[PDB]
Amino acid sequence: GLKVGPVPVLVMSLLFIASVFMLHIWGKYTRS
């Protein structure tokens, strides 16, 4: 199956955190 390592998992976690952060920023600056 799809075999992933520790660094890919860390990158995915950081990118998910960043994506949520951008979602918040985009919402805040589109309500303006």
């Binding site: 998992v9 949520v20 918040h24």
Partner: protein, 442 residues
């Protein structure tokens, strides 16, 4: 379900043993990711003013309301329990199935959390907001599963469950001591953290000796008696965690292998606390959901009388720590029942777990026979008898002592609670055991 199990990411097993430095590095990275994720709120939450339906399960799931770690470690716990029950009722594909149903619970539990009234009215959200909240919780649960599997497969020290629970408990204790948050009730700004409040009061209130009393015996905010009690309970739990029965064992298969088999007093390290706290938290949540909707029923009322909702009558009340010594004086039977239930439930969970998790005297004797281990002063046949003498008593008294320590921590008003302190100390001691293990391997 073989095709369904393969469509999931899994952590690659390390080719060579991971050094302790890199193990701590990955443990700290996992801890940092969890801590960042439990402070980042979900996107689309309309409101977070309603009372938390699952406020009592937060400590044992390591969950934070309204953030990416809303489910916390609940997916892992649910998947593990379901797999254990299924295996009882009847290996690589088994682990893949555990992750798969863990994610199904994550999607299912997200739907439940959405439609419990928290986050706001689901109908007013529409479909895009609810779907996106579900996606965020799904990805957060997937991340928790991936980091937990990383830690278990061996890039980190211990399981993700223990790391996250201990991290949340320690963060709570440090926040109740160093928080910059100040609350004012007309008497001025008072820091919510005990040490910062002590310094602020000493610097502000004319260096008065009443500032010491107001910072030590403070009742509206965390005080220094609570911190001193927390440190004292840490010391006592550490001292009792160092207890062990040291069996002198040798080996008859490979000679020259004299050694020590430690039978700790806390034979089940934190399993009594974990099971007992989980039972009480689930009972509290069920009682809240019943008395909040099906109020007035006799069975519901006996299950709990909530009255911040702290029970004041019923089974859930009698399973709750005494709020104040005045309640103990006016309701001595409540204090007696609480102490008895703590001790008895902890001891019973301890012995049940040694019978279940394959640490029973018969299981340990079978392990001794497999490896050829023999007690130094006992015959090869007289191994199960000595284990029968030691291990059941060790488990029962360890559970009883852990319950007594939880009672003492609750009565001393320690920051962290009894359970939180016992869980944190036991998990940190597990990490210390790991550390000394690789140190002795050198």
């Amino acid at each position: 379900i073989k095709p369904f199990c393969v469509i999931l990411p899994e952590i690659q097993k390390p080719e060579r043993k991971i050094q302790f430095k890199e193990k701590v590095l990955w443990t700290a990275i996992t801890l940092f990711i969890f801590l960042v994720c439990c402070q980042i709120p979900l996107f689309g939450i309309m409101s977070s003013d309603s009372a938390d339906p699952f406020y009592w399960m937060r400590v044992i799931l390591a969950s934070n309301r309204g953030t990416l770690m809303e489910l916390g470690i609940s997916p892992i716990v649910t998947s593990g329990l379901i797999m254990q029950l299924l295996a009882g009722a009847k290996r690589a594909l088994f682990n893949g199935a555990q992750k798969l149903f863990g994610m199904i619970i994550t999607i299912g539990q997200s739907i439940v959390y959405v439609m419990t009234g928290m986050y706001g009215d689901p109908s007013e959200m529409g479909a895009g907001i609810c779907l996106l909240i579900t996606i965020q919780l799904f990805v957060a649960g997937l991340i928790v599963l991936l980091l937990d599997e990383l830690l278990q497969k061996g890039y980190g020290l211990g399981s993700g469950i223990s790391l996250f629970i201990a991290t949340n408990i320690c963060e709570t204790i440090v926040w109740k001591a160093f928080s910059p948050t100040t609350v004012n009730t007309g008497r001025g700004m008072e820091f919510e953290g005990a040490i910062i409040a002590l310094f602020h009061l000493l610097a502000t209130r004319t260096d008065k000796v009443r500032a010491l009393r107001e910072a030590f015996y403070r009742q509206n905010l965390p005080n220094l008696m609570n911190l001193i009690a927390t440190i004292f309970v840490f010391a006592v739990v550490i001292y009792f965690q160092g207890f062990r029965y040291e069996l002198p064992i040798r080996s008859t298969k490979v000679r020259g292998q004299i050694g020590i088999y430690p039978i700790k007093l806390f034979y089940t390290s934190n399993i009594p606390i974990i099971l007992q706290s989980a039972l009480v938290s689930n009972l509290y949540v069920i009682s809240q959901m019943l008395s909040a909707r099906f109020s007035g029923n006799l069975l519901v009322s006996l299950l709990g009388t909530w009255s911040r909702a702290y029970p004041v009558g019923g089974l859930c009340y009698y399973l709750s720590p005494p709020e104040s010594f005045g309640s103990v004086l006016e309701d001595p039977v409540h204090a007696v029942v609480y102490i008895v239930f703590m001790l008895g439930s902890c001891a019973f969970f301890s012995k049940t777990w040694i019978e279940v998790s394959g640490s029973s005297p018969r299981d340990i004797a079978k392990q001794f026979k497999d490896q050829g281990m023999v007690i130094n002063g006992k015959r090869e046949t007289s191994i199960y008898r000595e284990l029968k003498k030691i291990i059941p008593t060790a488990a029962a008294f360890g559970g009883l002592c852990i319950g007594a320590l939880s009672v003492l921590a609750d009565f001393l008003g320690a920051i962290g609670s009894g359970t939180g302190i016992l869980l944190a100390v036991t998990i940190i001691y597990q990490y210390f055991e790991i550390f000394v293990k690789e140190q002795s391997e050198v």
